[PDB]
Amino acid sequence: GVPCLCDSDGPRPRGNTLSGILWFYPSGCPSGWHNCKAHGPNIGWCCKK
Numbered sequence: 001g002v003p004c005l006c007d008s009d010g011p012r013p014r015g016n017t018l019s020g021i022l023w024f025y026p027s028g029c030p031s032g033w034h035n036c037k038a039h040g041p042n043i044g045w046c047c048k049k
Contacts, residue, residue: 020048022046023046
């Protein structure tokens with residue numbers, strides 16, 4: 001998988017500008033994730049654990 005930049009991708013700890021992974025889920029983020037970029041990308045929603 002890839003880490004990507006997000007929407008609230010600012011006040012986050014380690015990773016800060018990459019503390020989220022892209023997601024290949026039609027329902028948004030998969031079970032255990034909670035989104036990072038509520039704006040995409042289209043190449044999988046970037047979410048995080």
